[PDB]
Design a protein around this nucleic acid. Sequence first.
DNA 1: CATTAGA
DNA 2: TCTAATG
Length: 327
Amino acid sequence: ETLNGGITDMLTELANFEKNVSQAIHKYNAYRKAASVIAKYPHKIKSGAEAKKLPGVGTKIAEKIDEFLATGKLRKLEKIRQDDTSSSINFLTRVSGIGPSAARKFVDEGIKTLEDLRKNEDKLNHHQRIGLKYFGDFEKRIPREEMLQMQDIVLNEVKKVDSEYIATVCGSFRRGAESSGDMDVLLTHPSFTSESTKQPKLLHQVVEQLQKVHFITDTLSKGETKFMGVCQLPSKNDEKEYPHRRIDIRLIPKDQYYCGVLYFTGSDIFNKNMRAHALEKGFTINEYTIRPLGVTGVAGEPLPVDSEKDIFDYIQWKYREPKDRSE
DNA sequence: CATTAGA
DNA sequence: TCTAATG
Ligand SMILES: [Mn+2]
Ligand SMILES: [Mn+2]
Ligand code: NA
Ligand code: NA
């Protein structure tokens, strides 16, 4: 956690580089397990050989471990960091919609800067264009204070549309968080569950409403169950217009709402930890259900969940407010 | 690990 | 169809 801090960090620096700049899933995969292992190890790695004993660490990495232990730096790491080609990628990759693959390609064609990207908006698909457009606003965090106004709105339309809808803004926002990166709204409806062959409009009508009033200003991707767009709080009585925010809305078969809600409320840790406990307590949890465990090794049969509680009760835990689902 | 765009 | 990119 700090005892092997640099080691794991340099390791991941290295991994990440293989995957993005290079397309070496293997080495890239290599750096990763090593990094995973040395991280666990309970003692201060004092040399490559010591490290070497570890599963995943071989000669290649052991050698890096040394140079780093001796000189508080690393060649390849100095080399890479400097490398403009590789920096370029690490940068373009910041555009929503641009991933490594496209970053490489662009770069090759010589598009390295944001500006290059502008002069060449033509080579960019919708997502990435919108991504390019709001690059600035997309990088900004969401002051909770705004999150509240946003939530406040979405709820009203959702409802105005059909009183039946149930919406819950999940995420860190949910968990108290002072600011969030983007807004996740989980939605479901009684007339939509596990069997009942969809009702795509269900998702569609809200979107349309939301757009109707100008909260959604753009669409990145809309499917029959998961809409991914951009929103904005009405720039009041001018002088202060609000930054463009990322928003995601997803339809859930009402029968698996809370499971989802549980899940997207995180945190990653609260999750696992919740997950591991349900295991002892003879079950299993996942993005959509909780199935009692049978002794034959495994077992199924989706228990009936009516609120976040039921999940709790099932695994027989203490209902933990979202506020404390921090780990 | 699943849902969407795109070509 | 596959393959990229988000989360
Ligand atoms: Mn989020
Ligand atoms: Mn999200
Ligand atoms: Na070994
Ligand atoms: Na990106």
